[PDB]
Amino acid sequence: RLGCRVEGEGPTYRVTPPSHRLDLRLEEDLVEEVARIQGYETIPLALPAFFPAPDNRGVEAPYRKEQRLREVLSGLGFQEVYTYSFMDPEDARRFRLDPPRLLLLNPLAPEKAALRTHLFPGLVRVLKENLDLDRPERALLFEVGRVFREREETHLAGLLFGEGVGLPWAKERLSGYFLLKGYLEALFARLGLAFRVEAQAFPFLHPGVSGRVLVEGEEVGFLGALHPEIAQELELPPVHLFELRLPLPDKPLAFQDPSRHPAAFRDLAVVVPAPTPYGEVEALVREAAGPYLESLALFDLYQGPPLPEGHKSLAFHLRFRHPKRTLRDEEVEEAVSRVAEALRARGFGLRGLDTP
């Protein structure tokens, strides 16, 4: 009826299409003809059943891993934000970043003429935009998205701004750098990874509040306060932020059967020259405390009289615990001595030790 000339008796016919149907070249083309004339409504419903070929197994682990990350983040308290992939080339200047690697030949507009190298610049802009339209007293955002530079890679970035956490009808508040660092340490314990911040400078960060993030021993990004000058140019209050490169390391479960025997406590303070980083001291006490150290915590940070000026003291609650049996005092003692020894061999003093 469609005009084709059918030759043959079957099962495989030689059907030659009319000259005006330029679209009829393959057999499939012809099967669509049978379908549209019979009606797509006549095609019955059905579901397929098969065992997938082996290499397709586990193929979604990645997607799943990133989706849990977003969920853990919103759980903690971060609010998700979506931002365009496009970047204003001029911004590479305003924020002090290397210039964009991919630029468009046909941009929607000049300010959308490049592909973002970082995530944060955009978050910072939506922050300002929010302040102007509505005047939020605070914000804690986060975004996961593609970033383009040398290679296309996924990043995670967030930003904290405003008054902070505390009793509404009181003034005492938790905020800024150490609050953001809190939400991050919290975030990292949930992912079950080792998180650490070493100080390092970044063009866009504030020199005095700038550091590099070390997840599972590797540098994955930064954390700090926005550089005041950039802050000034953009008319913003201070803002704290961070940016990391996903996918984060994966650490398996090594179950460690907890000891059914009592821990041994001990307190000790270390006198350290003001510039010495808390992290370095912590690492030292830890590395020296031995295989029986369970917990090490900082409870007091003091610096002033009568501490030899230009020095500070770090109070530490320690806990020693032996797995198979209880520890002999000589074991704890001798052990706290290995700490005291190496503590002074680095040039540190002992403001206090062996306190019950």
Partner: protein, 266 residues
């Protein structure tokens, strides 16, 4: 100067119980195979827990389950359709009763998985508990055959332990299935066959109980020309050998030093 390495504000960070992690892991595996998760009551009636599932009074089979019987006045146990169900009360010895409760209230075809806490009167040791968890499935429809049962468990093995995993089935007895079987998975990294659970084709008498009871409540019968298979497995057993937990008594022991270790597991 501001010391960036100083600990920040100490917000709390949560975690999920090993069993919730494991249960979640098994439910998503079956969700991918089209199974829906529905839960049932912990306090059951002897009818749904024993009688409907072909396990009658003074019968060898009844000895397989060490029941905790209950006494208590003024407690309302309600059946599938919100009706007051009358029977001798007990703490369920398995999740299977929920499969009868489901069948009386729904019509085939369908595929369900019912995770749940179950109880057995036993002396709690390093590998025995009186309170633990099971997960049972049920697929009912025209043409469901044992081949489909072997296929499901095959998919379970592949998902838990990899492509190099293989299942094994052997005959065993259960009052509520015929054929009946026990299945084991080849755990390639442990280099040994693990006995995971039981399964079989729903017993003719279980479908008769379902319909007969449906008729009692005014519902038309729905299980006349269908077949179906069911399987059931222990969660703790997996959870232990998968997360490396040596003592089953840790699960309900509530020790923070134990639970915190599973913070990283999603």
């Amino acid at each position: 100067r501001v010391d960036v390495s100083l600990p920040g504000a100490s917000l709390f960070s949560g975690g999920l119980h090993p069993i919730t992690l494991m249960e979640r892991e098994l439910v998503e595996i079956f969700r991918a195979l089209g199974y829906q998760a529905v839960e049932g009551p912990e306090v059951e009636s002897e009818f749904f827990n024993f009688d409907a599932l072909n396990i009658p009074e003074h019968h060898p089979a009844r000895d397989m389950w060490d029941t905790f019987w209950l006494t208590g006045e003024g407690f309302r146990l309600e059946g599938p359709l919100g009706e007051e169900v009358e029977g001798r009360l007990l703490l369920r010895t398995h999740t299977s009763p929920m499969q009868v409760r489901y069948m009386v209230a729904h019509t085939p075809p369908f595929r369900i998985v019912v995770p749940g806490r179950v109880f057995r009167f036993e002396q709690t040791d390093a590998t025995h508990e009186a309170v633990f968890h099971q997960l049972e499935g049920l697929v009912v429809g025209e043409g469901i055959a044992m081949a489909h049962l072997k296929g499901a468990i095959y998919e379970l093995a592949q998902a838990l332990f990899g492509p190099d995993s293989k299942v094994r089935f052997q005959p065993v007895y259960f009052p509520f299935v015929e054929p009946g079987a026990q299945f084991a998975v080849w755990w390639p990294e442990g280099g040994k066959w693990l006995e995971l659970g039981g399964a079989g084709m729903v017993h003719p008498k279980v479908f008769q109980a379902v319909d007969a009871y449906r008729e009692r409540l005014g519902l038309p019968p729905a299980y006349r020309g269908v077949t179906g298979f069911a399987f059931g497995l222990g969660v703790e057993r997996l959870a232990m050998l998968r997360y490396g937990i040596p003592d089953i008594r840790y699960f309900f022991g509530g020790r923070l030093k134990f639970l915190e270790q599973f913070k990283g597991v999603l």
